[PDB]
Amino acid sequence: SLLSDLCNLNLSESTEKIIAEYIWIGGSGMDLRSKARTLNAPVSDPSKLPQWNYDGSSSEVILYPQAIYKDPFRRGNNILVMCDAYTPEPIPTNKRFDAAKIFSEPWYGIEQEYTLLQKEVKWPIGPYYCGIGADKAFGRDIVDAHYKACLYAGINISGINGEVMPGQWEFQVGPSVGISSGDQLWMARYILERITEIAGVVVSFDPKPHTNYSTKSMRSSNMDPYIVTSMIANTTIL
Amino acid sequence: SLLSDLCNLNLSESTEKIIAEYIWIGGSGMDLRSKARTLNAPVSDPSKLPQWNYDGSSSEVILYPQAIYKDPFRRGNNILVMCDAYTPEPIPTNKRFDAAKIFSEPWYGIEQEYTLLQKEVKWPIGPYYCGIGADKAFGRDIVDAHYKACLYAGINISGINGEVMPGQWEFQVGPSVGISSGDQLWMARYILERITEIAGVVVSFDPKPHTNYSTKSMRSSNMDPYIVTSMIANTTIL
Amino acid sequence: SLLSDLCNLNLSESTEKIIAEYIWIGGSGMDLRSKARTLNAPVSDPSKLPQWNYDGSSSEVILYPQAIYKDPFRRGNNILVMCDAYTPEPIPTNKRFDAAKIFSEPWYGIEQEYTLLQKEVKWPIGPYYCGIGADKAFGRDIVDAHYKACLYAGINISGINGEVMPGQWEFQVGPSVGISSGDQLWMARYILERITEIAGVVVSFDPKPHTNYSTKSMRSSNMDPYIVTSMIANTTIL
Amino acid sequence: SLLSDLCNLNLSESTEKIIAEYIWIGGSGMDLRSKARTLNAPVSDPSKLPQWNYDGSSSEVILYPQAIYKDPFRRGNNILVMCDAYTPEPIPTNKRFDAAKIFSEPWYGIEQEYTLLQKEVKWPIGPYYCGIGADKAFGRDIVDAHYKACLYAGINISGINGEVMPGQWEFQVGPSVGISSGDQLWMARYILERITEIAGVVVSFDPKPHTNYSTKSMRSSNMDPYIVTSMIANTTIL
Amino acid sequence: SLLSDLCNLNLSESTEKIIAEYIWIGGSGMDLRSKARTLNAPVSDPSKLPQWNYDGSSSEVILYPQAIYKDPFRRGNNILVMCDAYTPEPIPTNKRFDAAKIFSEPWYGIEQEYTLLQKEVKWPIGPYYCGIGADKAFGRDIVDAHYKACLYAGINISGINGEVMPGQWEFQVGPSVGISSGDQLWMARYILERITEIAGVVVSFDPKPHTNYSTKSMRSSNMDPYIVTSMIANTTIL
Secondary structure, eight states: OOSSSSSOOOSTTTOOOOBEEEEEEETTTTEEEEEEEBOSSOOOOTTTSOOEEEESOOOEEEEOOOEEEOOSSSOTTOEEEEOOOBOOOOOTTTOOHHHHHHHOOEEOOOEEEEEEEETTTTBOOOOOTTOOSTTTOTTHHHHHHHHHHHHHHTOOOOOBOOOSSSSOEEEEOOSOBTTHHHHTTHHHHHHHHHHHHHTTEEEEOSSOOOOOOEESSOOOOOSOHHHHHHHHHSSSOO | OTTTSSSSOOOSSSOOOOOEEEEEEOSSSSOEEEEBOOOSSOOOOTTSSOOEEEESOOOEEEEOOOEEEEOTTTOTTOEEEEOOOBOOOBOTTTOOHHHHHHHOOOEEOOEEOOOEEETTTOSOOOOOTTOOSTTTOSOSHHHHHHHHHHHHHTOOOOBEEOOSSTTOOEEEOOSEEGGGGGTTTTHHHHHHHHHHHHTTEEEOOSSOOOOOOBOSSSOOOOSOOHHHHHHHHHTTOO | OTTTSSSOOOSTTTOOOEEEEEEEEOSSSSOEEEEEEEESSOOOOTTTSOOEEEESOOOEEEEOOOEEEEOTTTOTTOEEEEOOEEOOOBOTTTOOHHHHHHHOOOEEEEEEEEEEEETTTOSOOOOOTTOOSTTTOSOHHHHHHHHHHHHHHTOOOOEEEEOSSTTEEEEEOOOOBHHHHHHHHHHHHHHHHHHHHHHTEEEEOSSOOOEEEEOSSSOOOOSOTTHHHHHHHHTTTO | OOSOSSSOOOOTTTOOOOEEEEEEOOSSSSOOEEEEEEOSSOOOOTTTSOOEEEESOOOEEEEEEEEEEEOTTTOTTOEEEEEEEEOOOBOTTTOOHHHHHHHOOOEEEEEEEEEEEETTTOSOOOOOTTOOSTTTOSOHHHHHHHHHHHHHHTOOOOEEEEOSSTTEEEEEOOOOBHHHHHHHHHHHHHHHHHHHHHHTEEEEOSSOOOEEEEOSSSOOOOOOTTHHHHHHHHTTTO | OTTTSSSOOOSTTTOOOEEEEEEEEOTTSSOEEEEEEEESSOOOOTTTSOOEEEESOOOEEEEOOOEEEEOTTTOTTOEEEEOOEEOOOBOTTTOOHHHHHHHOOOEEEEEEEEEEEETTTOSOOOOOTTOOSTTTOSOHHHHHHHHHHHHHHSOOOOEEEEOSSTTEEEEEEEEEEHHHHHHHHHHHHHHHHHHHHHHTEEEEOSSOOOEEEEOSSTTOOOOOTTHHHHHHHHTTTO
16 A cells, blocks of 8 residues: 555544635646645535635636535545636636626537547557457546546536547536536546546547537537537527 | 546445446447446336437447346446347347347257457466366456356356366356347356456457257257347247 | 456345355366356255266266355355266265265364475475474465465364475364265365465475374274275274 | 555554654754654543653653644554653753743744655656646645645645646645644644655755744744744734 | 455354464574464463474474463454473473563563564665654564554553664563563564564564563563563562
8 A cells, every 4th residue: 555545534533624626727728727725614505615816927816616516536525616717807718707698508418529648658558439358448447437436526427438549538418507518528627637647648638649409498719618618509599 | 556446436425327338239240349328317127218329330320228237347326238239120230130029938058158368469378177276277367257247247147167178168148038048148248358358368259269948838159149049949939 | 456356246235146166076186176156045955956967078977065165265155065976876086985885973183285386487485393484484375365264164174384394384174073074175175276376386285296083982095085084984983 | 465454453442552653853954753652541631641751862852742643654543742852941952942932822824845856866756837637746646645644633734736846845734823833834744754755755845956924813044833933923922 | 466365354254263373482592483273262361271282303392371362463363372382391492480480560671672684685675763754764564563463462562663773673562560571572572573474574683683670569691581580580579
């Protein structure tokens, strides 16, 4: 148990403190980053978690709690929260205020693809449609881990399946509220981004390392979940 | 424990989702393929799962649920589902519609070999009938795993044998009622396909990498099984 | 983690089926073989099990349930059975019919010795009389495993000790009733090989790689657990 | 396995002998040292633990119980104790008597940074600001372990984050009352080294391999939690 | 999980038999040998256990159950026994008869030192006074294991500490009564070797690879836990 018997300890035995990691979109847009801080009492309602901030130079950017769900790598009562960047008005990189004001029942099953690479070499490991056996499932345990972690957290994920291109996969979100579909993707794009970090594997959400619409009824710019859903919710009723 | 901490979480606490993988026969060979997707509530009756499909060009091929049995590698309430390839007329590769219409009380204890060798070298890992000790059993952990997973799932499996020539094995399929011996010899043939894949072991069903009949009206080989189980039933129908 | 998370699943959770490992003696008398096959209800009475058989060419040879004890490598309700070989009259290699007819309450104890050697060079791994410390005891974990497995199964083993010969040990089968005594020894020998099979070690019982008598009063030449006891009983207790 | 089966035994059944490790500050640098000592009755009141001592030549140096917290690597009822060094008057290296006499309710939060390097080459293992995935976070397992151990012990650590230069972090000691605040820093720092000792990594706190103040009126070159805190409270809490 | 899944099985679920490790002192006085035996019912009274013996040629030498403690390497109801060598008159190497007749309430505390070295090269593995982290403490896992095992067994050990010379330590047993005091030391010594057996390390107690006295009335040349205590009791109490 070299650095493995730890990282997993009971919570309520000693203290009542619960961590709550703060997550936000950074960099060019594909880099989703986070850092940790505790709390006092376990509450899942987003209107009680205190605000916070960080320094953007490393530019004082404020963060507000929006999504409070559970945690893959810590269990019990530990919590992940999804927060957006506000410039010292929202920051232009946020790209969420417009979506919030537009969406303020458009269920969206956004479809996303991800490819696995061997991080020591940055290449994929090693009839291919959902193949099994040798030279087919390059880290199918990683996929099991991500699927079950997403079920545990609170992400509404709705299936996963491989294709012909080696290593790569894709998973489905299905029945998620429009604005929620801008959260439940990004967090689910985050959890996976950590899981392969355990191994010598990296997920690259890129083409070369679909948007469902089921409204309750009617009653009325590259790779951004929020931008795509906002654009396609424009024109169409809601 | 790299990546193995996950894959073995629980679902009775967080979300009542029960992943139900969908399985269908592949192309020319006996490559039983499958892909994963979810469900909502725990039900074992195959008359309630909705009819789903896939793309065959990677064309549209629809699948229906008929075999609903528990999971070796996921446990809990997760389920494997056996499905056959229909076209919205059964595909010739199906070879199950004729057997179903013929059988709708014969019991088939068909015998099958599952010669298994090493992955990288395609060679065995290491008076030989059911040998024990050095240079006798080139991996019995996977074999015990397959046996117990088969009993756990719901397969009515009965026996297992060793072999003299290094490598070959065999398991009995048990008292399977007619068309049921088209499920309990494929999905119980599917389970092994993952277990060897867990290790550096490849199972080579081919002869060069028996037919039973126990009816109640008192009247009386892997690869291709549907044809076999059905032709010898026609000869002695009910 | 890999390949070992299986092999340890539970029985009574899914199905109340039981398994059984049918064990017979090899041609030369030093090899002990077995093959596995299931059963419906768990019963420990040797009379209730049904009579089974095998092929002697690998020539039909029948086997009857003689000794029913529990299983260390599968735990739960899994059961080992010691059975003798019958020609379709006892088979000459059986050597048990004479002992059974002779013994049909002598308490007997027989001593066993065995040498452990490396798999591919045939030398022991790594004052020696019950020695401890550097260059004294090698593979004492195997010894602990065998001792505790033998207590668990039903073998009434009594003690083990190490001697001067490198990689040499000796265990005592303890007081036990009549022919069952000899029978018990066989399972003990059996168990050892499987445990040694885990470690990649070769066990040699041959001399170049004591018999205890105690009764009430009167019943109311190559390492043979049956010939030796029959000869030493013929003269005094039959 | 290799010693890991031990180190984790329970004590509430065999012997209720609470251990206690006596922690004292080292010599020139920041080398917080200790040794173990058993006790009879488990009590957390620092006014009942017996005084102890040691030899300073490796000179008698008495030690008195000040801080009683729980234990990362022993758990159960095992307790760590933080004690200051007294000459047979305070020792000059103690630096705590001045702080105690000054403080005899200013809340303090101090900032700590530490750089991780390889054991035998001194380079660190393996947009960086709180980065995720590969090439951003190296050995976050150590960091998660230290964070959760610090919550478990009794340290009221409050937050943690990464930085831009490769291979360092920063954790927030949290708001606490009086001199205990400074004490807690030392204690928490202690835990880190033990955890790093598991991984074969060297922790360097040196700059080249801030303080928060709030009162009861408000709310909640040496790297000395004592000198800096006392100097800040000299000018305000007096 | 090879070879280690066993060795930790349960006792009371299958059989109520217990084990017992009979331990005697080697000829040279520095080696402490033992061998295993079985018992029917678990009893901790040294009077009820049966006398046993061995062969001194590897010359019969009788042994009696003197000290009964629990077992760290088996848990459950398994028991270790410390026994002395009696020739059917005590053997001169015993050295315990004189101490027993001298002592037949002086509390004694003895100090022990040991050095850890590599199995092959004989050099130690890997300011040192009670050092922490890298370059100070090597193999503290062995030390924590021995401390906790000694608490578990019944040895009322007091404390342990590091020292200056690389790779050597010292533990202390002080709350001991009568001749059992010396006895306890011996048993504690024994445990250490078995633990080091797991790690592939060599323990040397030799100087070149303290006695505490307190009575019920208080204050009103080899390393032999018996010779030293008998000599220092002669001048005071007995």
